[PDB]
């Protein structure tokens, strides 16, 4: 019955994969499908070049799929149909899988009397949306994704798996469109909803890390460069050639530093043609961030244009243009005076976290803590008719 | 309005109670009657258009001259004339409510 299914795939398979097959016979026979759910999940890590896995999953889709969590049917299948680069085939199989879950659920909600099976339907819509994105039918996925969004907001008891599939899919949509800002924030939402459970690979970490860094550089309102640095994802891979510069570019922006930043930018024109037409953008961007850092870090809030001029290595004419661009973008609110030659800022959007920024805030409260304490004695003492 | 008998405070709106008679006629259109469907009062339909129909389409000409656009028509004549029927025929042309 299953005997043919497992025996054929052995020959096709690498020898080092032979035991796995035999372990699938074994936990069928024990009638213990707890260990089976783990074994299938494991299979695609060791065999992601070969779609031996997809053919294997077919048998188990139609057998246990209420006698195993449905969460686990979505986890092993996703690796198989994502990396399938025949996407007609992907759509067709997923739609038939959805029809089986819609029949099943009506009797089984009262029959088990402990389990749910409506959870599974949402996730299939997410996989269906991903297949459309790769296929390059970006609009078809997005309107599927919007209807799915509605359902999710009206539930509050939904698994942590559901949110993880939905945000991943939404990120891929903004990466096709190349909306840098939109990508950055929705990929941050994937990172949060990450599960210790297998629903990631080793490949995916390194590739989100590349795409995040690139988006960040080219955002129009990002200043979450320090937030990325401190994050695990980008921390571990800096020792490879691709992610070496990529780290040092991200680092030179965080710190406002021009000597390291400009030296990197020369290399990347030749190296990467993506960053050979954003050359103008990246130089305006470092200067823009530094501008907010210099006035703010001081306890005087109003600052002459001259000091900015040597700092952003630009003359006075561009200083005013930098300042104007920020206000437009809704990053600062304030005034420009070329009469008094002053920039007087009065609203700031949140700064990067760093220990030393913390230190400068903590020292700044000290100054005015003294005044409250000394005044609190004067007023108390004074008054002889406080309740007389 | 509707107000408590416990604290004499207006709690909530009471939308105004429609008076049935005038309300029935606002709701549905009383039209059309045809111009050549009325016989012998045919002149008197036209004469109404000059008073009402002209300044309604364009207040714009009356405003050029500066003389006020003219309104107020008293309908009279022995009963059964069908002047209430003519009220409908005038406003049937304009499609007026």
């Amino acid at each position: 019955e299953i005997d043919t299914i497992l025996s054929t795939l052995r020959m096709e398979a690498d020898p080092s994969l032979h035991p796995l097959f035999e372990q699938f016979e074994k936990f069928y026979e024990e009638k213990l499908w707890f260990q089976l759910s783990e074994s299938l999940t494991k299979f695609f890590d060791d065999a992601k070049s070969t779609p031996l896995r997809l053919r294997l999953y077919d048998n188990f889709v139609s057998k246990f799929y209420d006698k195993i969590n449905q969460l686990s049917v979505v986890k092993y299948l996703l690796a198989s149909l994502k990396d399938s680069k025949d996407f007609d085939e992907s759509l067709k199989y997923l739609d038939d899988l959805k029809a089986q879950f819609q029949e099943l659920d009506s009797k089984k909600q009262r029959n088990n009397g402990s389990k749910d099976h409506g959870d599974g339907i949402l996730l299939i819509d997410s996989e269906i949306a991903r297949t459309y994105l790769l296929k390059n039918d970006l609009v078809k996925a997005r309107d599927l994704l919007d209807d799915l969004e509605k359902t999710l907001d009206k539930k509050d008891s939904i698994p942590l798996r559901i949110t993880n599939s939905f945000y991943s899919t939404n990120s891929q949509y903004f990466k096709f469109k190349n909306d840098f800002n939109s990508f950055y924030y929705t990929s941050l939402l994937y990172l949060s909803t990450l599960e210790p459970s297998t629903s990631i690979t080793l490949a995916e970490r390194q590739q989100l890390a590349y795409d995040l860094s690139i988006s960040a550089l080219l955002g129009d309102k990002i200043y979450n460069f320090g937030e990325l640095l401190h994050h695990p994802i980008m921390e571990t891979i800096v020792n490879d050639s691709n992610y070496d510069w990529l780290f040092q570019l991200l680092n030179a922006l965080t710190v406002g530093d021009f000597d390291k930043f400009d030296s990197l930018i020369k290399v990347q024109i030749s190296k990467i043609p993506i960053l050979a037409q954003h050359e103008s953008f990246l130089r305006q961007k470092i200067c823009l961030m530094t501008l907010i850092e210099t006035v703010f870090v001081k306890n005087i809030r109003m600052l002459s244009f001259e000091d900015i001029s040597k700092a952003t290595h630009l003359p006075k004419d561009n200083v005013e243009h930098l300042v104007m661009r920020a206000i437009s973008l809704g990053l600062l609110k304030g005034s420009i005076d070329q009469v008094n030659e002053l920039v007087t800022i009065s609203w700031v959007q949140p700064r990067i976290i760093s220990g030393d920024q913390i230190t400068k805030m903590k020292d700044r409260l000290v100054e005015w803590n003294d005044q409250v304490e000394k005044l609190g004695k004067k007023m108390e003492a004074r008054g002889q008719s406080i309740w007389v | 309005v509707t107000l408590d008998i416990t604290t004499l405070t207006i709690m909530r709106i009471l939308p105004r109670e429609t008076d049935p008679l005038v309300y029935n006629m606002t709701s549905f259109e009383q039209g059309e009657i045809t111009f050549d469907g009325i016989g012998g009062l045919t002149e008197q339909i036209r004469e109404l258009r000059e008073v009402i129909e002209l300044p309604l389409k364009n207040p714009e000409i009356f405003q050029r001259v500066g003389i006020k656009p003219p309104k107020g028509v008293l309908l009279y004549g022995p009963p059964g004339t069908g002047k209430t029927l003519l009220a409908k025929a005038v406003a049937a042309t304009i499609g007026a409510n």
Partner: protein
């Protein structure tokens, strides 16, 4: 119409059949009215033509039956407002065509009308309500299916500085292709009115962003000379779009307002309250992270 007696002939049709009818059909009647309006366009009496439009009701074109005459009704009106260089009115008339289902539904047919709408909204002067109307089109997704139109419009929707010589050079070959807003012969001289709007935009943006500026700086910002700068500000004070004080020896121009003692300390009233508000919120968030973490 072939003949020179188009003057004479224009007049015949308009006198007689302007008067009402009591036994003629509306379909037949409208068709002559458009004709009468077209002839009033050809003569150069647009004062005639504006009356003829409203002597047929706007409410007899909102049926599917007179959906064909809806396209015509709004086509002839455009031209009447277009000659009297009144651009606010042209834009609305064209948005009725766009919303017409035949134009909206077909891919090709929507393109010529939508480019017209954009052109006239941008040549309209920036009102209060103007911002909302250009930001409707902005929200449209069929704005996104042209790229000439896309780049052009976004510049003025958003508050941002964009120099007159960059517009003059770049957008001359792009927009002279489409006729009757920049490539007509009567509308060639609407490139002069492109210049007035960009710089007028430039002055409104600058009003927010500066509060005092020298006149010498401002000549670079608009790229206009000293004489031109002072003059174009002074008219804006008469149309009541800004308040500025303009110093005639080429000194300084201040786009800011005379204030009162009271008003300025109202902002301090708010900064102090909001600062305090933060100290209250902060106080219970600290305790929360203290116990739990």
């Amino acid at each position: 119409k072939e003949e020179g007696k188009i003057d004479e002939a224009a007049d015949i049709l308009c006198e007689l059949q302007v008067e009402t009818y009591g036994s003629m059909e509306m379909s037949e009647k409208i068709q002559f009215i458009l004709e009468q309006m077209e002839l009033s366009i050809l003569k150069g009496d647009y004062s005639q033509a504006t009356v003829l439009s409203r002597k047929i009701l706007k409410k007899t074109f909102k049926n599917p039956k007179y959906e064909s005459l809806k396209l015509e009704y709004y086509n002839l009106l455009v031209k009447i407002s277009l000659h009297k260089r009144e651009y606010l009115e042209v834009a609305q008339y064209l948005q009725e065509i766009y919303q017409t289902d035949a134009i909206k539904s077909d891919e090709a047919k929507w393109k010529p009308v939508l480019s017209h709408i954009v052109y006239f909204l941008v040549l309209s002067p920036y009102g209060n309500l103007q911002n909302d109307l250009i930001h409707k089109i902005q929200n449209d997704n069929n704005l996104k299916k042209l790229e000439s139109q896309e780049s052009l419009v976004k510049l003025f929707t958003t508050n941002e500085l964009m120099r007159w010589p960059i517009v003059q050079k770049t957008y001359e070959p792009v927009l002279n292709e489409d006729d009757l807003a920049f490539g007509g012969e009567a509308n060639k001289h609407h490139w002069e009115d492109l210049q007035k709007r960009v710089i007028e935009h430039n002055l409104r943006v600058i009003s927010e962003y500066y509060s005092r500026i020298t006149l010498l700086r401002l000549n670079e910002l608009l790229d206009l000379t000293e004489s031109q700068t002072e003059t174009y500000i002074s008219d804006l004070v008469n149309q009541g779009i800004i308040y500025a004080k303009v110093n005639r020896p080429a000194k300084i121009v201040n786009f800011e307002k005379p204030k009162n003692s009271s008003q300025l300390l109202n902002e301090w009233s708010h900064n102090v309250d909001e600062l305090l508000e933060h100290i209250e919120t902060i106080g219970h968030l600290i305790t929360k992270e203290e116990i739990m973490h």
